[PDB]
Amino acid sequence: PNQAQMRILKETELRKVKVLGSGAFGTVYKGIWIPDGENVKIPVAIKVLRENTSPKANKEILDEAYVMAGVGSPYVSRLLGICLTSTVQLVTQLMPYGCLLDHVRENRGRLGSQDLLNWCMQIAKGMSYLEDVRLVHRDLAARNVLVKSPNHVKITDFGLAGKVPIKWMALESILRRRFTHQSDVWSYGVTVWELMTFGAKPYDGIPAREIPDLLEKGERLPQPPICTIDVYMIMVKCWMIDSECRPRFRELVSEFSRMARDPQRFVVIQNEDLGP
């Protein structure tokens, strides 16, 4: 099997139009791809990496590309091509609605119960595929989920597939530096919390150094107002200190698909918030 096609791109058929974001791993540009000597223009995102660890990170980036060049899950962004300059550039289809975090932030009061439960199902499906292909994301978050259409999301970034945001990290990853698929389930729980809070900041105001002591003392993210205890209880399972107490991604797929089939039973939007 595995007949995927990597389209090695010449840099001259790529136009960087606008910076969309940057971080530790590279800069993402909104841009236009014009196949070599072809008549089409495709809206693309281009992430140009750095020059550091050109000896070692290129190879780990190469295999990230191998795993995400296959047409695998519709809920994982697929790599269109690689630009093999001195600084490796990755070209990919542009999801026009942007990253989920700021999508849900500016559509508060515009999203119902099924839209929120449908995403959590898809995001769990996308992570379930990554678990089947032996990839640990390490940085699952609302900011790292894309909106293709109002009811279709994709997991992306993978620059980490020290520098991990500590508020999405499992406790065993903070203390023992250990990353498993079950630590990604913890990240899944936080991401769902972000959705159900319409893009609230986890542990807002709490410094990152205090987080591990906070978690070791038994505190977790609070119950979102629109969550029933059914939904909140799934997140709580994802934050068990024992990694084998947390749900499996194939279980999270079934439970959120069950709740998406009856969204009124499990998410109550009428409760956006209340003023004190």
Ligand SMILES: */C(=C\C(=O)Nc1cc2c(Nc3ccc(Oc4ccn5ncnc5c4)c(C)c3)c(C#N)cnc2cc1OCC)CN(C)C
């Ligand atoms: C939200 C800022 C924001 O809206 N950004 C975007 C992002 C868009 C992306 N994102 C993207 C992520 C990671 C990339 O690097 C890859 C490395 C390896 N891979 N294997 C498979 N796929 C990859 C990607 C790249 C190149 C891009 C994509 C994609 N893919 C498409 N369209 C995007 C649009 C966009 O905004 C446009 C409105 C931040 N707030 C501040 C929280």
